[PDB]
């Protein structure tokens, strides 16, 4: 069978407070996990994940085909040319099992200067009808800000881990401008299950999502309690155990760039499981113009031979 990945449970609650030595001890655990498999579970995070799962289920199970077309991104609906990121990503019965809903910063309103300028990667969110989904928009926008707050705390820990002051990343992660997204992904139970929605890895593992690195600074993930993720290590792909009380955290390729691959973006994949489940990532993205000068925490002088890359350039290139 497959070996279990080392994915430690880190109590992140000190990152919300003012005990600086305790925060350093959290930062050390973040450093160790980031140098090993690249994954950890954040525990004691303060977010009501059971209610997130309930509200998400109520949405996924009640939205109708009509509503999905009305909310669809341009890949599924040619009438919606402004929807590249935000909206509904449809299933294709018989072919594509997964479906999802993506939303961006609630502050990206019609009057927001980056919306007025039509800057790439910025869009105004689309929402289902309030009478059909009562409370959903409000819940979802509040969730954005709850996970934003957890992510800001995690970014203080990553900064400390790397020998930086605790606002080194967080100062670029701001409510008025962050490019961060929430995706509410439904993986369905299907009988029979479409073979076209099952991919096969070179090692024979049946997959729902092939190997990749994340397009993010960090990724902050809730999943149901159905084991599915695997991480590539030197010892091969290893199983990430599920924990539906925690958030699974990893670095994305912008972190790898800034740190000269000291904190790698781990390669991971999703196993095929015929189970009704949820995958609810928050992609921690900075602002469009944010630039962090690359560095290397393994070199006496910290210098890297990588060129500065704005987050907007990174994101537009990555989302293709
Ligand atoms: C591994 C999970 C995080 C999940 N997959 C995913 O979320 C995958 C790979 S990280 N996500 C993406 O490709 C990027 C979505 C970006 C989003 N539309 C945005 O505009 O910001 C899954 O369960 O398949
Ligand atoms: C699997 C989900 C992340 C979502 N897919 C996506 O966001 C994929 C990721 S490469 N991107 C597009 O479709 C555009 C889906 O529901 O199809
Ligand atoms: Fe991923």
Numbering used by the authors: 3 to 322
Report text from the authors:
IPNS is part of the superfamily of iron(II) dependent oxidases. Crystal structures of the Aspergillus nidulans protein5, 6, 7 show IPNS to contain the double‐stranded β‐helix fold (DSBH, also known as a “jelly‐roll”, cupin or jumonji C (JmjC) fold) characteristic of the 2‐oxoglutarate‐dependent oxygenase superfamily. These structures reveal the presence of the characteristic “2‐His‐1‐carboxylate” facial triad of metal‐ligating residues (His214, Asp216 and His270), an arrangement present in many non‐heme iron(II) dependent oxidases. Movement of Gln330 enables formation of a salt bridge between the carboxylate of Thr331 and Lys98, with the six C‐terminal residues (Asn326‐Thr331) taking up a position that extends the final helix (α‐10), thus enclosing the substrate in the active site.
Removing the seven C‐terminal residues to create the tailless I325* mutant provides important insight into the mechanism of IPNS catalysis, particularly the role played by these residues in shielding the reactive species generated at the enzyme active site during ACV turnover. Several minor changes are evident relative to the wildtype protein, including minor alterations in the positions of the aminoadipoyl and valinyl side chains of the active site‐bound substrate, and a small rotation in the side‐chain of Phe211 relative to the wildtype structure. Notably, in the I325* structure the β‐carbon of the ACV1 cysteine is clearly exposed to the external solution due to the absence of the C‐terminal helix that would otherwise cover this region. Furthermore, density consistent with a second ACV molecule (ACV2) is observed near the primary, iron‐bound ACV (ACV1). The valinyl and cysteinyl side‐chains of ACV2 appear to be well‐ordered, but electron density for the aminoadipoyl residue was not resolved beyond its Cα atom. Extra electron density is evident adjacent to the cysteinyl sulfur of ACV2; the size and shape of this density suggest another sulfur atom (S′) bound in the mode of a disulfide linkage. A further very small peak of density is apparent at a position that likely corresponds to another atom (C′) covalently bound to the additional sulfur S′. However, an alternative pathway is available in the absence of the C‐terminal residues, which would otherwise adopt a position that extends the final helix (α‐10) relative to the Mn:IPNS structure and enclose the substrate in the active site. Without these residues shielding the reaction centre, the thioaldehyde in 24* is susceptible to attack by a thiolate (or thiol) nucleophile (ACV2) from outside the active site, leading to an enzyme‐bound hemi‐thioacetal/FeIV‐oxo intermediate 29. The formation of 7/8 from reaction of the tailless I325* mutant with ACV provides direct evidence that reactive intermediates generated in this more accessible active site can be intercepted by alternative reaction partners and diverted from the reaction course seen with the wildtype enzyme.
